[PDB]
From a paper:
To determine the mechanism by which KorA induces the KorB closed-clamp conformation, we solved a 2.7 Å resolution structure of a tripartite complex between KorB∆N30∆CTD and KorA bound to its 14 bp OA DNA duplex. The asymmetric unit contains two subunits of KorA that dimerize via the C-terminal β1 strands and α5 helices. The DBDs (helices α1–4) from opposing KorA subunits dock into adjacent major grooves on the OA DNA. The asymmetric unit also contains two subunits of KorB∆N30∆CTD whose opposing NTDs (strands β1–3 and helices α1–4) are self-dimerizing (interface area = ~1,250 Å2), showing that KorB∆N30∆CTD in the tripartite complex has already adopted an NTD-engaged conformation, even though CTPɣS was not added to the crystallization set-up (see Supplementary Information for further structural analysis and discussion). Therefore, we reasoned that KorA–DNA may facilitate or capture KorB∆N30∆CTD in the NTD-engaged state. The DNA-bound KorA dimer docks underneath the OB-binding domain of KorB∆N30∆CTD, specifically via α5 of KorA interacting directly with α10 of KorB∆N30∆CTD. A network of specific interactions is established at the KorA–KorB interface, including KorA Y84 and KorB F249. ITC data verified observed interactions, showing that KorA (Y84A)24 and KorB (F249A) completely abolished the interaction with KorB (wild type (WT)) and KorA (WT), respectively. Overall, our results showed that KorA, via its C-terminal α5, directly interacts with the DBD of KorB to lock KorB in an NTD-engaged closed-clamp state.
Author numbering:
A (entry chain C), C (entry chain D): 2 to 108
B (entry chain B): 51 to 259
D (entry chain A): 52 to 259
The structure:
DNA sequence: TGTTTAGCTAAACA
DNA sequence: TGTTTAGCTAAACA
């Protein structure tokens, strides 16, 4: 599934505009590994509410987890610009493999 | 032991000179700047003139149009010169080429005029002391597809070798090349064109498979 | 505040999974030029519901109005390549705005 | 007219503003002008001064290339005239009007004049250029390390772009260095322009 | 048992 | 008067 550690979770909700209950639900599920239905039953919410709550935090996490100096972008582009964006991505994932394999080689 | 001062009023620019009026070396900045140095220090590179066969007493510039204009703007009556009556159009091209004064268009147009005389690329190359390949590259400019032409004239691309690369690409996949050019923000360079070709090859190969 | 011709509207709702009321609201606003508050007042909805209804249909339109080859792409890029991809999108949104006002002007 | 001078009585000026690796002094370059000189002769006579410290010999004011190409053609002599009032700035002017000087050559010439206690004002005057032209080339004398690498490996050659890059780097160095550290990144007026736009978009979302 | 997305509100904001 | 976006339901879906 999707699981986080408490520290990973901490970082995801930092400056996220979300209230108590979403945090409670997400920590329950992502961190403590509790099934979403438990919260649905106990807070009297639809299974869809709970799914949405988990999803907010999980997305937040993926956004903060992108290497610094990088960003997700999404767009609708001419074919030619499509190609370029794809070529950029490849060259970028290579440079991160060299950054990763380098940290790993030093420590 | 010297050149000789000639009155400017007895000197005329050659109207078949290979540089065109829109040459950047004929810009008001260019001429006013050379006027400035001429006023201060004098003309220290004397111009070459021939005697005007059809109009006694007057001269035609072989080389030195710019000094000649700059001399006027500086307010000079005369200009250092010497006479060389054995100076033809190729000599002019050569001297301008040696000074990197000719635009790609100017060179291509000079080559057009020689082709139009029934001369052969071989001998046009010889007469301006350049390679067959130099001539060929510039010949491409004499008959450019419409959009590539616009790009070249508006100066979006100036390097004759990139223009060559574009035309090859456009002969194979025109509508795509036109879309690429129809984007005002697209810089045209060896590298951007390279990416264009890579893109086209990615399409060709999903065209057959 | 922006409008669709009948035919542009019809193309936007073609195969769009939305109910009658959204269609009715959108037609009123984008085709008939009636203000959204009319519908809010008459159907007893918040101004935000009606704004959302209009927005669904308007989006649908922009999606169908893309030239061929355009396509959503997602990538993780160095920040400055992200900027360019965003600049590309803007310049493209402008060209589609000019394409729409021209179809409508031919009609 | 002008007068034919023996080549072996002519020496190049060692303070000429073009340096040995100037592209106009390349073997092709000389071979090409040699070729035209063999065929048609030198039709733009060179300027020399009399060598005060070595009677009967001459120093080139302008025409080094014709002079080399005259040798390559196998000539005894070369058309010339004497102008004994021809200084270093006159050389810079002549070379600038022929676009023969590299940005580095111009910067280094400006370095030498500053080192003599001349002021930008007067260096500008004496080569008939603007104070802004002097400033732009001064930037090249002390470039940040990575911008220097780019300039000397010839990734960027345009003095105005190099200036645009340095300005960017003075305000946001880390970012500018990351940009340059990408081997695929073309450096041009336009790419740099996009870089600046990007940086300005970030400063604002720093205050937002 | 969890995901998705039209459709709704609230309520700050433009 | 219209926009935005967390948060809720419903209900089709796997």
């Amino acid at each position: 599934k999707k699981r986080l550690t408490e520290s990973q979770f901490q970082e995801a909700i930092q400056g996220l505009e979300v209230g108590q209950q979403t945090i409670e639900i997400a920590r329950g599920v992502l961190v403590d590994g509790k099934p979403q239905a438990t919260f649905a039953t106990s807070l009297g919410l639809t299974r869809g509410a709970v799914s949405q709550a988990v999803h907010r935090v999980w997305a937040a996490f993926e956004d903060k987890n992108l290497p610094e100096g990088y960003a997700r972008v999404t767009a609708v582009l001419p074919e030619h610009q499509a190609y370029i964006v794809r070529k950029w991505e490849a060259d970028a994932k290579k440079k991160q493999e060299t950054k990763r394999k380098l940290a790993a080689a030093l420590e | 032991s010297g050149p000789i001062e000639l009155d400017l009023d007895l000197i005329d620019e050659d109207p078949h000179q290979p540089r065109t009026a829109d040459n950047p070396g004929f810009s008001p900045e260019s001429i006013a700047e050379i006027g400035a140095t001429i006023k201060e220090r004098g003309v220290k590179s004397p111009i070459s003139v021939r005697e005007n066969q059809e109009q006694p007493g007057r001269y035609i510039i072989n080389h030195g149009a710019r000094r000649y204009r700059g001399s006027k703007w500086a307010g000079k009556k005369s200009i250092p010169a010497f006479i060389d009556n054995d100076y033809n159009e190729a000599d002019q091209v050569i001297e301008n080429l040696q000074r990197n004064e000719l635009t790609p268009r100017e060179i291509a147009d000079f080559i057009g005029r020689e082709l139009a005389k029934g001369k052969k690329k071989g001998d046009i190359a010889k007469e301006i002391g350049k390679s067959p390949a130099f001539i060929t590259q510039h010949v491409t400019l004499l008959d450019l597809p419409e959009k590539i032409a616009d790009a070249f004239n508006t100066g979006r691309v100036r390097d004759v070798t990139v223009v060559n690369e574009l035309v090859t690409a456009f002969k194979k996949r025109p509508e795509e090349v036109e879309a690429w050019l129809d984007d005002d923000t697209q810089e045209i360079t060896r590298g951007t064109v390279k990416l264009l070709r890579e893109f086209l090859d990615e399409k060709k190969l999903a065209a057959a498979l």
